Amino acid sequence: EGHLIYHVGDWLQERYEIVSTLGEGTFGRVVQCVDHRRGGARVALKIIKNVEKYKEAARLEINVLEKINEKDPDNKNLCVQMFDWFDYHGHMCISFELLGLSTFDFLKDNNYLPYPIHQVRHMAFQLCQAVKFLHDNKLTHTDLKPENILFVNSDYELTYNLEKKRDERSVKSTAVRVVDFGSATFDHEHHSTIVSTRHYRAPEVILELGWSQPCDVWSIGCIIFEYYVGFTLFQTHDNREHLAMMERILGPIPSRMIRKTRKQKYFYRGRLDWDENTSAGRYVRENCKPLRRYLTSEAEEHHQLFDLIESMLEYEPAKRLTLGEALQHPFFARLR
Ligand SMILES: CCN1/C(=C/C(C)=O)Sc2ccc(OC)cc21
């Protein structure tokens, strides 16, 4: 498949002693290494497949990662640090700071039982800070999701949930980092027509009306919801169904966006061409509901969170909350 074959103990660059495999994917593999040129510091080495397209994609990430480091010498940006990069016999290798499991991995290991609201607040704040940094530097991440947000340390402690009568895993530290900048696009760069993983895709991306920074905010909205409930907001792999789910959860699509889109097969009489009476329409009715019906409590802090999610899930990209605004939200008031 083009993967680099390696054994526990191998030395790349005569520098990186392989300890274990941290991750795996279609990009390649991530390996924990002892960096003998950095005092024996444990690093995370992303080894990209020996494949033309993935190599060219890795170089674009390296370009973003170099801009990330440049514009953040003190490492306050909450984006993953690249310490080194090199070309190893066709394999692009990137040396990262060692982190923990993804916020998805942790949620999954916790039976998809949601994060506590106080942890959601700290996770959401850091997410907004990290992407705002990118937004300030003329960048859009495009591929934001629980998998691309990692805990710095994913060590947990067992905590009883008196309500659900179950034991829950609670991460000791909620410090997170944003990873995977392979899709990151500069303002001047060639924008792809379709971006984001399905579940976190903004409606302007679906309707192909052009996209920039606002589409990241839409993703962050979905992610934060997922942190609060446990399951993904839009569970679908179909455009027309996705748009129907959007309408049920958030209300009608703005008339201007229907008017402007070329995706006119999805629309009839200036409204969404969706029949709720079908078995597909009934499925949408029984698998999702208006956004605020997902509240686990009526306490003020829970309502403030959904004020934030709702503002982030504004249909119109230009009318959508910016991340500079997001950090000023009443929901983040009780943080140091
Ligand atoms: C496998 C997750 N992962 C990355 C993934 C991608 C696609 O970039 S980048 C990364 C860096 C450190 C780490 O520590 C454990 C993990 C890590």
Short mmCIF file of N, CA, C and O in Angstrom, two decimals, residues 115 118-120 122-123 126 151-153 171-176:
data_model
loop_
_atom_site.label_atom_id
_atom_site.label_comp_id
_atom_site.label_asym_id
_atom_site.label_seq_id
_atom_site.Cartn_x
_atom_site.Cartn_y
_atom_site.Cartn_z
N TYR A 115 -18.86 14.62 27.40
CA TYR A 115 -18.00 15.34 28.33
C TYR A 115 -18.85 16.22 29.26
O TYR A 115 -19.89 16.74 28.85
N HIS A 118 -18.37 21.56 32.22
CA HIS A 118 -17.23 22.36 32.66
C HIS A 118 -15.98 22.03 31.86
O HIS A 118 -15.12 22.89 31.65
N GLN A 119 -15.89 20.78 31.39
CA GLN A 119 -14.81 20.35 30.51
C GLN A 119 -15.07 20.78 29.06
O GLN A 119 -14.13 21.15 28.34
N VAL A 120 -16.33 20.74 28.64
CA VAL A 120 -16.74 21.26 27.34
C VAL A 120 -16.34 22.73 27.20
O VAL A 120 -15.79 23.13 26.17
N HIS A 122 -13.89 24.38 28.67
CA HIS A 122 -12.44 24.53 28.51
C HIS A 122 -11.95 23.99 27.17
O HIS A 122 -11.01 24.55 26.58
N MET A 123 -12.58 22.93 26.68
CA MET A 123 -12.24 22.35 25.38
C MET A 123 -12.66 23.29 24.25
O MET A 123 -11.89 23.51 23.31
N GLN A 126 -10.39 26.55 24.04
CA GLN A 126 -9.10 26.27 23.42
C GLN A 126 -9.21 26.04 21.92
O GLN A 126 -8.35 26.46 21.15
N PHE A 151 -5.96 15.64 23.10
CA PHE A 151 -5.55 16.00 24.45
C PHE A 151 -4.03 16.01 24.52
O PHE A 151 -3.37 15.19 23.87
N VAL A 152 -3.49 16.94 25.29
CA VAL A 152 -2.05 16.99 25.55
C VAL A 152 -1.67 15.75 26.35
O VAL A 152 -0.67 15.08 26.07
N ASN A 153 -2.49 15.44 27.34
CA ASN A 153 -2.35 14.23 28.13
C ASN A 153 -3.74 13.62 28.34
O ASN A 153 -4.62 14.26 28.92
N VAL A 171 -10.93 12.83 31.96
CA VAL A 171 -9.56 13.24 31.67
C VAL A 171 -9.05 14.23 32.72
O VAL A 171 -9.74 15.19 33.07
N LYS A 172 -7.85 13.97 33.24
CA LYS A 172 -7.27 14.77 34.33
C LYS A 172 -6.99 16.21 33.90
O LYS A 172 -7.19 17.14 34.68
N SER A 173 -6.53 16.38 32.66
CA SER A 173 -6.26 17.69 32.09
C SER A 173 -6.98 17.84 30.76
O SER A 173 -6.91 16.95 29.91
N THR A 174 -7.67 18.96 30.57
CA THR A 174 -8.47 19.18 29.37
C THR A 174 -7.74 19.97 28.27
O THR A 174 -8.34 20.33 27.26
N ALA A 175 -6.45 20.20 28.47
CA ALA A 175 -5.62 20.89 27.48
C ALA A 175 -5.60 20.15 26.14
O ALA A 175 -5.28 18.97 26.08
N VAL A 176 -5.97 20.86 25.08
CA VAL A 176 -6.05 20.25 23.74
C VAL A 176 -5.18 20.94 22.70
O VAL A 176 -4.73 22.08 22.91
#
